[PDB]
């Protein structure tokens, strides 16, 4: 669903701004995570973190610990996926907004 992707895109941009965090200087990383989140939301119903391996994705979504934004991000601003980075992170850029085309360049592959 394209509306799901756009929704996830909007979520990421707004959450970054709200938490004073920034996207990776390499937006291709950002794009991969956002699309992954969107895919999980479409399949599981929740934006389960896409950069992890699960023994039971359905149970994970029910528990909610890894539903984006996850507990480590909400509490410690720790984002394993490298989606939301603090200003002092060596890989953080100056953007809190990503082009829709960039996201779709990932969708095709």
């Amino acid at each position: 669903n394209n509306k799901t992707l756009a929704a996830m895109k909007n979520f990421a941009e707004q959450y970054a701004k709200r938490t004073d965090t920034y996207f990776c200087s390499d937006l291709s990383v950002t794009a991969v995570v956002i699309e992954g989140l969107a895919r999980h939301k479409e399949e599981l119903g929740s934006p389960l973190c896409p950069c992890r391996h699960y023994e039971d994705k359905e149970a994970e979504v029910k528990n909610t610990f890894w539903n984006c934004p996850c507990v480590p991000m909400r509490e410690r601003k720790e984002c394993h996926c490298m989606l939301f980075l603090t200003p002092d992170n060596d890989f953080a850029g100056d953007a809190q907004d990503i082009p829709m085309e960039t996201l779709e360049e990932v969708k095709a592959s």
């Binding site: 149970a59 994970e60 528990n63 610990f65 507990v71 480590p72 509490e75 410690r76």
Partner: protein, 73 residues
Amino acid sequence: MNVGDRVRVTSSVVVYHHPEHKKTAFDLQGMEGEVAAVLTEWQGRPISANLPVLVKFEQRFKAHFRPDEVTLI
């Protein structure tokens, strides 16, 4: 480590959701609270939470920890 146990944060744990420190870095080390839950699974199904020990402190504040970050009081 069980629900109900009284624990103290014995490691550096910096959070941003503390009531009197919302959106700003705050180290919980030294704070004492009670274990509210241990997220090892959901209704019998194994889950992979990496901060399974949910501890509740006063001021209507709670946070998650790894077993090694807290100590029984």
